[PDB]
Design a protein around this nucleic acid. Structure first.
Lengths: 63, 117, 146, 207
RNA sequence: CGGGGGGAACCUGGGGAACUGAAACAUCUCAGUACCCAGAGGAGAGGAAAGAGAAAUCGACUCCCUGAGUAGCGGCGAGCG
RNA sequence: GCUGUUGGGAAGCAGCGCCAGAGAGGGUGAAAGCCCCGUAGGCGAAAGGUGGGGGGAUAGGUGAGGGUACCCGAGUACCCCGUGGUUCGUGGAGCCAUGGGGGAAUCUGGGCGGACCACCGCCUAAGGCUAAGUACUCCGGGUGACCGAUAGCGCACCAGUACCGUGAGGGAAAGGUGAAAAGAACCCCGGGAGGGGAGUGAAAUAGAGCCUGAAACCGUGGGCUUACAAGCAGUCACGGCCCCGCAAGGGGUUGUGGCGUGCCUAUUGAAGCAUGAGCCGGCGACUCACGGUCGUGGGCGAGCUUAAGCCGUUGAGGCGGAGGCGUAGGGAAACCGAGUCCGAACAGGGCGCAAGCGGGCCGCACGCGGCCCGCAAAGUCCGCGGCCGUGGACCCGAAACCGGG
RNA sequence: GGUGGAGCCUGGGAGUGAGGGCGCGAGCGAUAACGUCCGCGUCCGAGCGCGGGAACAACCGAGACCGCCAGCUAAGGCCCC
RNA sequence: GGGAUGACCCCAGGCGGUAGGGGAGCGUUCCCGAUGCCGAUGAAGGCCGACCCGCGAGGGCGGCUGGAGGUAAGGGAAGUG
RNA sequence: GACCCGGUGAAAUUGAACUGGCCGUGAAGAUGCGGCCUACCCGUGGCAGGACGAAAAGACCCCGUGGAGCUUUACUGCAGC
RNA sequence: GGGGCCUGACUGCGAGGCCUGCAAGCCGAGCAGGGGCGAAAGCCGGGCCUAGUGAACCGGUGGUCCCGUGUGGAAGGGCCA
């Protein structure tokens, strides 16, 4: 029958206009204890490739 | 629709059985045995068509040799005359002159060994 | 036009791909010739290796919702006066939905770019900068819904 | 670009000429026509081909023999797909071959068919039916005195049952009705005849 | 006066798995599925709001299309919905 | 609708007509609207069910202010504990059900609106009943891009049999003479069985598990060929012999001489002393459904498009815009918007947008308007095809787990 | 310079992730192994197609579209087989 | 490159190949074509064929058997070898 | 009993066989490749060295995130107390 | 190696690159905020340099403008640390 979106993915990565997959930078939910502002800061969003391609394929019905 | 086998098979089968006539034992009564035997027949030919072409070059050379030797020289020297002299002719096949026209052949030899004198 | 000749165009290619015979896609069946492809592989959209999928990336979308459900809310779908200059006279949602945008998509904003025609535009909210373009002849209907 | 439809001598008034829109020979696209036909000939498919799968065969699961030391190939239940008592792999299942062909195309393809019937001249719309009264003998005459000898399989499309009554039982004749104006019939028939009332709706349908 | 017993599927109620899936596996899945039992009938169940949920709203229930793979649920896994 | 014609047999071919609201189809010695049964179309029940589709009959229901403040379903509401249902798995966990303990009230009441409280609203629990629309197919009928005797139900046939098993249970094989029995009087060999003539038939290599009759396999006769030999059995080159041809030439056979390590599978590598196969015939493995994603053929494009179902047919279609994708994106969100998020920041940076034209042609306003076109800015809808997802998803094959017996 | 079944960008579908011999430079081993592990290259794999090497995947020669009773050669040979 | 687009001829290169990608064809069954056309002067099937067309899968054609069905072009589906 | 004659008359096996020896070779143990040696064709009664002979998808070993039986201060529950 | 001041072991960013299958790891001028040291030039976003480490999920403390299931506020979340 029909297809189910993957909530796991839907909950952590956003898909943009150009069809690009964008998600937070992984490495700071707790690592830290002292990491030079630079590291702990430098955390906006980012991409992937051949990998985001794999994502979009799970967020179909949610386009 | 139900595309039952029916006619189709039985036809391709007796088609190989035909190519396989005259073979020993089952090589001609069994599609399988046939099928195989034929494959061998397939390449044995192919290869021998190319062998045949080399087969007759031998026949000729041996004769060509035997002829211009009982005359005076060998096959090594003989083909060098008809080559230095420039008579890019005979063609080991047409060297049946040694069989038919010895008077014409002997002529070639004489104007061949002479190409060395 | 004769009965027996309306024929499929030049690309209906019913040519499927049977994979059984001597020449063509065949025997081990056009593809595969190893194993673990005999009745199923794992994915790979998101699976295998046996390792961290690629699920090492964390959830930002902070607000996956409590259990009661998503919260009812007025939904605003903005429109471009750019696509608005297709008709003249009275411009109000309803004549807007059955026309182009919205389609019961709740409320209607209004912003866009490009030249704006000097008329009346009945909207629920106007974008600052894209409203100064209506300061060059036009209307300004606001609020509503009750 | 030519568009002129015929019209048999009504009562006692000469053959009247009538025409309008790219309905007559306009710009025909065979493809579009053929697709509307499959749709018709297809969606009219019964689709009752069924087979009993191994799960569906009326045998048992009991293992014919022991997996080992039998000197026989291994097997499960007789029902398995191999085995003569069969099971049938991917047999046919009752299913609908009916899809939804675009409605706008189910029209351009209706007009285009009543187009290559016009340019050929085989098109012709009447209005009267002297020898009506619902009798074949009666009708058979009405044709001769029109151009319908019987050398060109005809399609009759008039909203008058009385007339059908006749045309019906004729080989080279294919009765019908206005509402049922399709493409599969227009095409299967060499010459097309239509009344001005069934033609009246034609356009209400086309545009 | 009635009951008992039978009836292919269907139906409602009382019970109720495991293999499987999670590439092990306990929660989770399979699943209230298969199966047992009771009852009823040409159907059964349900049924006139101590309902819905945000609209100065709607107005028995059953059933189909949508909503919707939505809102959510989830070793937030698989997957359910 | 008869006749002539071919033939065993016309319905075939032929000459001239005819019915048709009936040219569905089946049968008849072959292939027929018109010969037989039917068909379109139109009638039919003394009896037995069915039966508001249509009228009655009653059952039963019929009224608005203003004062009281009497009744509004109890081990119940409600709270706590233990669980189940719901999308809800302890979660902020309400709501609905209830095994246990406690335990009211009768509208200034009480339940609910996802803890709880306050406002604002919604509905009246603890008694029942209730058509139609929905589900299924043993049987009956009707159609089929359903099968055709290894298919199709297990069973076309005296089959849930024969046969197997203590039992539950398992579970077969097996259709066909011809138009018609006209199924072979009698005679000959024989105990019989079988046969040879005669006889029937158009046909008897249609003679009775008899149409067709394939291959494996078994024989008789004939042609070529072999007892100094050596081989995956063939292939190539000559030569003898037999044979159809007017002949160039071509068959069948095999005497010499040249060259050759089966097929399949699995493998770094197989003739391999690795796997599989006695041989033949038949059954036998990449499918469909719904989503998705690329390609591709068409439809239409500021758009595209219907779903359930309703009026139509009964191989004819329409209608139906609920709804879905697209037209704008950024942000966790409030939200802002050709911007937006991070930020104090008319620093920066991250996702974003900025999208056209060769020009057919034309009102002859010395304006390229602007239709249209490749099909787009840009997309959708249907078709077809590749691969992905859920399904037993390419076919066979476990040891095992569970449930009822 | 180089127009090559070269490259570069986007997209559909893959198979393969058991390799093997040889030469060269190393480690391991005993400078033993048709051993083992890396590195550069080659060939077999998939060229068990053809020539030479008696026979013989990978050594020498050489990339087999078909046919030829025609010729030049490569490796290797020229007494007979 | 010809270019009377003439997919019909010229110039020059390529054409071993497993897993696999891609491209065109052949046959099977059923459907439209069909109230049509083959047919007892002989269907489908079968048995031979050194003959004809295709590179092939195949396809024609002739004789014999057999005795009643068969079905072009052009397409369409699928229990398709 | 076996052996000869009359009567009845199986079986596992079975790629096809026109199935010799020796050095050598080859995926390292050849009737089947190479060189040489032998060797008329066909049986019957015997013997068992070879056909890596038959039989049994190795009972050993390993591998499979295979299965079952058993244990306990493995984990986690449950009956019971 | 010693001394004097100090807290830049900064906040908001980040051009352009090393490395790489993914995600990670590393370097970084320069602009703004507000500072240290120096007369100034200037240097300071820890340490002479390469090890001193751990995705996500689940939760805890701070903060905070975000959401608060009819409204106000809560419970509970989100964001930054």
């Amino acid at each position: 029958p029909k297809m189910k979106t993957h909530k796991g993915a839907k909950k952590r990565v956003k898909i943009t206009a150009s069809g690009k997959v964008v998600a937070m930078k992984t490495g700071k939910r707790h690592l830290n204890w002292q990491k030079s502002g630079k590291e702990i800061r430098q955390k906006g969003r980012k991409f992937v490739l051949a990998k985001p391609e794999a994502e979009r394929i799970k967020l179909l019905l949610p386009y | 629709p139900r595309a039952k086998t029916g006619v189709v098979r039985r036809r391709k089968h007796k088609k190989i059985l035909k190519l396989a006539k005259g073979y020993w034992g089952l090589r001609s009564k069994s599609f399988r045995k046939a099928r195989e035997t034929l494959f061998a027949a397939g390449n044995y030919a192919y290869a021998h068509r190319k062998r045949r072409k080399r087969d007759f070059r031998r026949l000729w050379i041996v004769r060509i040799n035997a002829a211009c030797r009982q005359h005076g020289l060998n096959y090594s020297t003989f083909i060098h005359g008809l080559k230095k002299a420039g008579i890019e002719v005979d063609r080991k096949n047409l060297a049946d002159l040694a069989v038919r026209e010895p008077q014409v052949f002997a002529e070639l030899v004489e104007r061949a060994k002479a190409a060395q004198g | 036009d004769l009965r027996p000749n309306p024929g499929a165009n030049k690309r209906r290619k019913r040519v499927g791909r049977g994979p059984g015979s001597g020449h063509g896609k065949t025997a081990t069946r056009g593809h595969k010739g190893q194993k673990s492809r005999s009745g199923g592989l794992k994915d790979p959209r998101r699976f295998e290796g046996g390792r961290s999928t690629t699920l090492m990336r964390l959830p930002k979308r902070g607000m996956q919702g409590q259990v009661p459900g998503e919260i009812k809310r007025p939904r605003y779908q903005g429109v471009n006066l750019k696509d608005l200059a297709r008709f003249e006279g009275e411009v109000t949602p309803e004549l807007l939905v059955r026309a182009g945008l919205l389609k019961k998509g709740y409320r209607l904003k209004i912003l866009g770019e490009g030249e704006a025609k000097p008329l009346k535009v009945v909207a629920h909210a106007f974008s600052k900068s894209a409203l100064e373009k209506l300061k060059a002849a036009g209307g300004e209907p606001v609020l509503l819904e009750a | 670009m030519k568009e002129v439809a015929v019209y048999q001598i009504p009562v006692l008034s000469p053959s009247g000429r009538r025409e309008l829109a790219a309905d007559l020979p306009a710009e025909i696209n065979p493809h579009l026509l053929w697709e509307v036909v499959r749709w018709q000939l297809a969606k009219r498919r019964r689709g009752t081909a069924s087979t009993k799968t191994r799960g569906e065969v009326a045998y048992s699961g009991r293992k014919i023999w022991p997996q080992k030391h039998t000197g026989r190939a291994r097997h499960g239940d007789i029902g398995a797909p191999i085995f003569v008592g069969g099971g049938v792999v991917f047999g046919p299942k009752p299913r609908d071959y009916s899809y939804t062909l675009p409605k706008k195309v189910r029209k351009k393809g209706l007009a285009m068919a009543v187009a290559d019937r016009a340019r050929e001249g085989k098109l012709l719309l009447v209005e009267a039916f002297a020898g009506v009264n619902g009798k074949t003998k009666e009708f058979l005459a009405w044709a001769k005195e029109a151009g319908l000898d019987g050398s060109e399989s005809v399609l009759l499309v008039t909203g008058n049952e009385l007339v059908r009554r006749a045309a019906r039982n004729l080989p080279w004749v294919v009765t019908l009705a206005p509402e049922g104006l399709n493409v599969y019939d227009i095409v299967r028939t060499e010459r097309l005849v239509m009344d001005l009332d069934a033609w009246e709706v034609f356009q209400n349908r086309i545009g």
